[PDB]
Design a binder for this molecule. Structure first.
Ligand code: HEM
Ligand code: HEM
Ligand code: HEM
Ligand code: HEM
Lengths: 146, 141, 141, 146
């Protein structure tokens, strides 16, 4: 991921303020509500029929934290996204059968969530850096597909 | 929107496909799984090896739904209502994949109907397949 | 299609934007140009530096067009008819770019409407901007 | 790009048989007919009001040959598409203002034309290797955009 040092410092700066638990839940929940077809992977999560059902589902919330924990771990290895996510790539491909376009949608929803939480602090330049990061993470997760 | 000339172009082109529709659907699918392996995520239950019977059988179904569309070109939403329901509420295929299958159908047609795949005809078929895709993703949300 | 609840959500959110529309349009454009630089290729005649007067002026026009679409939510194809012809025949912006501007508009609204930008509303707005983009793109070929 | 040796040799073998004059003219003209908005870059070529006009246009044909010539020279440098097309990327961004999304369209159109020309010989495996090349070229042409 071609990220300038100032891009990289902006990302890490903001990320230190993130409550990953809560942000992971909001991002995954919003994915399922705005793009309802993504619900096809989570039928074992129970009730996903309305917005409150999705957003407050404890299983969505717990899974959200698992996703963002892995994402965080990625921000600590920005120069080697592909190796960091290799096993997660294989798994999403060979076992879970998830179309990688889903990783792109999630990235964009995460960007909306950050903007939602941080307001003016999510400046255009900071957004532009995060857009590179989410694309890099999506490309890394897609890389082992075959 | 399909123009009168597009409709004529597609009807003509599809007409020549005739009894080969089945084989061409299968071929387009194979071309899709190979060129764009992400599309295989939607068929983990299929044997996807070359010449397998699931793909052959599935090719016919796809090709037949297209024949139906051509015949009902002026009333696609109604003719394809059930398939739209299927793709939107059960299968839930990401919309981006429709473009990939469409291209592969175009390549299959270009490979089999050299005389008929003129530039105007190429343009009409691409519009037609796009129109079909819009309808099929129309009820997603 | 937009549902009754979608329409309600969109009028409510945009209503809260109010007299901030122009400003949010300008910021949406800045966000797009910085996050997706390829979009700059359509504006080589503009000064694109921060605070640019041209960006500000164009932000206002984008925002006014959206305000109109909201005012005529039950007749958008006709309300945006002129804009759709302009984009299709004079400007000829590749369709993929509409998704980028739409995403940047949502990011802008989220950043400025913390209480109204609920999941249900986020969903409605996304559907709305996608219907706007569809109209603007409907006469390309 | 990540091209398999059997993939590399499939591409090369087929390209040895391509009539660049015919194929170049056909690819560029079809792009203009199938995606009419791309005509915005070629106003100065003349009449483009109809397919026959576009396909008959001598500037279109001449320019199509030049494009495939450049493409031709990229296939001899498949391990360094980026360096090979750097100046061309710069020119397409800074002087011509061409949205790179157009590069993807030309690519897919190119594939359709190779199909039309070679029929049976353009098998699913040959197609797959050519889709990789085409994306590679598009990506290399977009790389110096800023
Ligand atoms: C930022 C991108 C993503 C990351 C980092 C991520 C990470 C993870 C992790 C760490 C797991 C648990 C692995 C395990 O159980 O062994 C997981 C599971 C899973 N992921 Fe992802 N994920 C991402 C995006 C997605 C999206 C977009 C989808 C589908 C829309 C998805 C589908 C699934 C499914 C269905 C599971 C298993 C759920 C279960 O336990 O039943 N993932 N993901
Ligand atoms: C040109 C657009 C398409 C048309 C006309 C089409 C047509 C059809 C038809 C006729 C069926 C059979 C339903 C039945 O058994 O009655 C079907 C099912 C199915 N389609 Fe599509 N399809 C299209 C695109 C897609 C693409 C883009 C995907 C995703 C890559 C996809 C994935 C599926 C799957 C997974 C099934 C179920 C297959 C099975 O389990 O037997 N379709 N489609
Ligand atoms: C939300 C969807 C969009 C809307 C509502 C919209 C609206 C408008 C409006 C109202 C104008 C002014 C025309 C006039 O002066 O009467 C305009 C012009 C223009 N738009 Fe759009 N637009 C949209 C998306 C885009 C996209 C995605 C691009 C390209 C990335 C684009 C590029 C342009 C350009 C280049 C002009 C002419 C600017 C000038 O030369 O002054 N628009 N648009
Ligand atoms: C396969 C991808 C492409 C390649 C390899 C390519 C290569 C070239 C080359 C070698 C030239 C000649 C430059 C010179 O005279 O020094 C050129 C010019 C040009 N290209 Fe491309 N090109 C590609 C795609 C496109 C597309 C998709 C467009 C827009 C639809 C485009 C727009 C132009 C324009 C407007 C010129 C200037 C032609 C003139 O002299 O009037 N190119 N390109």
């Amino acid at each position: 991921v071609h990220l300038t040092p100032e891009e990289k410092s902006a990302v890490t700066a903001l990320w230190g303020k993130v409550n990953v638990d809560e942000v992971g839940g909001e991002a995954l929940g919003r994915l399922l509500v705005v793009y309802p077809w993504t619900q096809r992977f989570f039928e074992s999560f129970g009730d996903l029929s309305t917005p409150d059902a999705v957003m407050g589902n404890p299983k969505v919330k717990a899974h959200g934290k698992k996703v963002l924990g892995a994402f965080s771990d990625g921000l600590a290895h920005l120069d080697n996204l592909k190796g960091t996510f290799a096993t997660l790539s294989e798994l999403h491909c060979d076992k879970l059968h998830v179309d990688p376009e889903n990783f792109r949608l999630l990235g964009n929803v995460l960007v909306c969530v950050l903007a939602h939480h941080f307001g003016k602090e999510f400046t255009p330049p900071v957004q532009a850096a995060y857009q590179k990061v989410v694309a890099g993470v999506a490309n890394a997760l897609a890389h082992k597909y075959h | 929107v399909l123009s009168p000339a597009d409709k004529t172009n597609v009807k003509a082109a599809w007409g020549k496909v005739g009894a080969h529709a089945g084989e061409y659907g299968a071929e387009a699918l194979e071309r899709m799984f190979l060129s764009f392996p992400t599309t295989k995520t939607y068929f983990p239950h299929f044997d996807l090896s070359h010449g397998s019977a699931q793909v052959k059988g599935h090719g016919k179904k796809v090709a037949d739904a297209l024949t139906n569309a051509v015949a009902h070109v002026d009333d696609m939403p109604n003719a394809l209502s059930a398939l739209s329901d299927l793709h939107a509420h059960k299968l839930r295929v990401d919309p981006v994949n429709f473009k990939l299958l469409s291209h592969c159908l175009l390549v299959t047609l270009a490979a089999h109907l050299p005389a008929e795949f003129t530039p105007a005809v190429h343009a009409s078929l691409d519009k037609f397949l796009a129109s079909v895709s819009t309808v099929l993703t129309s009820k997603y949300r």
